Ligand SMILES: [Ca+2]
């Protein structure tokens with residue numbers, strides 16, 4: 001169980017420094033010698049597609065993931081069509097931004113019919129896959145924590161996302177493992193091994209006791225209860241050699257100037273992850 | 274699509290009327306003609322074992338569950354022995370109070386080793402079941418929501434509790450289905466059908482948007498997103514003819530005088546559940 005030697009596999013999700021814009025973020029990651037960055041669609045729209053592309057290409061930055069496509073379930077069918085056209089836009093944004101994986105959180109159920117919303121998710125992805133494969137982008141389903149099933153999206157366990165991804169070849173669809181959303185799982189390592197050759201991303205955070213916020217309760221590594229090194233050795237034995245993003249939703253760490261939190265990021269990425 | 278015509282299957286868990294004592298609770302349910310009550314160990318110790326039995330024996334009340342045994346994982350072995358001695362004391366309390374099922378929430382992991390804590394849970398239950406069957410009490414494992422995996426207990430999915438219960442006879446150990454802790458599950462109905470002939474209790478609440486508290490985020494039926502009628506028809510097709518407890522953890526419903534909340538309880542038990 002030895003530690004990493006470089007930060008070449010490290011990546012920085014924009015939302016761990018939500019205070020910063022995209023070019024402030026890029027400056028911060030080259031200042032901290034961080035090679036990989038994960039871009040958010042709202043910040044890219046803030047800056048501009050071509051402008052953001054220039055920003056992170058003259059920083060010499062590689063793009064791990066673009067967040068986030070999805071939000072498939074809607075109350076009616078024209079709304080679903082608009083949502084999957086927004087997913088096509090997100091696909092194009094990932095294509096010209098050279099993103100490795102387009103992260104998909106799929107959307108919550110509009111009513112109480114949760115299984116119907118899951119079926120909507122599956123048919124929407126099956127549809128979206130040709131337009132994704134045409135432009136060289138791969139879609140990665142990110143299972144969320146079951147406490148987000150009512151609010152943010154409907155895929156709640158890793159087994160479910162792996163089942164959805166198994167219908168398509170790994171080059172078309174894969175899964176995204178975030179330790180915050182699935183560390184609790186009793187069948188954690190079994191499902192991780194089952195999803196091997198199909199893992200497209202790895203995000204790291206920690207589960208804090210006690211939870212401050214439901215939507216903003218993540219923290220940085222080493223302060224919570226998750227056994228990070230074990231999970232990521234499991235995901236590397238699963239054949240995942242890609243970048244490792246750290247994605248933290250926390251107000252207390254967002255208010256802090258980003259240089260502090262990127263120093264702490266690298267230090268405890270080398271110590272724990 | 275059906276409803277209930279009587280309230281003979283309804284039960285009242287003490288903790289949805291946390292303000293009231295045990296004799297206040299018994300008086301409230303005889304005033305409301307509610308036949309079944311579920312008792313908590315702290316209030317029973319407050320009143321006294323023999324006294325509490327007399328209180329609920331001249332009220333003509335039947336007792337569905339006793340809350341709560343468990344808390345098996347501990348940092349050391351003498352501590353685990355003490356925890357299972359307290360579990361023996363809870364078994365005795367359930368036996369002399371004529372409780373149908375002794376509810377077990379199993380306890381959190383002391384460190385970060387969660388799987389070791391799960392192993393501790395199962396070996397503790399395996400030890401505890403002879404002393405339980407001897408006194409005529411049946412243990413019922415209650416799987417909690419995965420967001421409680423860090424804090425309150427370690428069994429987080431229905432499949433896990435059913436797997437633990439399958440080792441012992443249905444008369445020895447069974448599972449407790451609460452819609453708050455298991456409504457999210459993608460394999461909900463499949464695991465419910467798998468757990469048939471072994472369901473010992475049914476708790477109902479609703480998942481509110483947005484969650485007020487993580488540990489006190491339940492509400493009364495009809496105010497959330499849970500498909501209560503579907504889940505309880507699934508567990509009734511599973512052969513569960515026992516009482517239906519309603520267990521709500523909410524400050525907003527705790528402020529109310531208990532007559533209000535038991536009136537609303539019956540109204541929305543017949544209307545929704
Ligand atoms: Ca993400």
Ligand SMILES: [Ca+2]
Nearest residue numbers: 340376415520
């Ligand atoms: Ca309970």
Ligand SMILES: [Zn+2]
Nearest residue numbers: 178203204247
């Ligand atoms: Zn993540």
Ligand SMILES: [Zn+2]
Nearest residue numbers: 415451476520
């Ligand atoms: Zn419960």
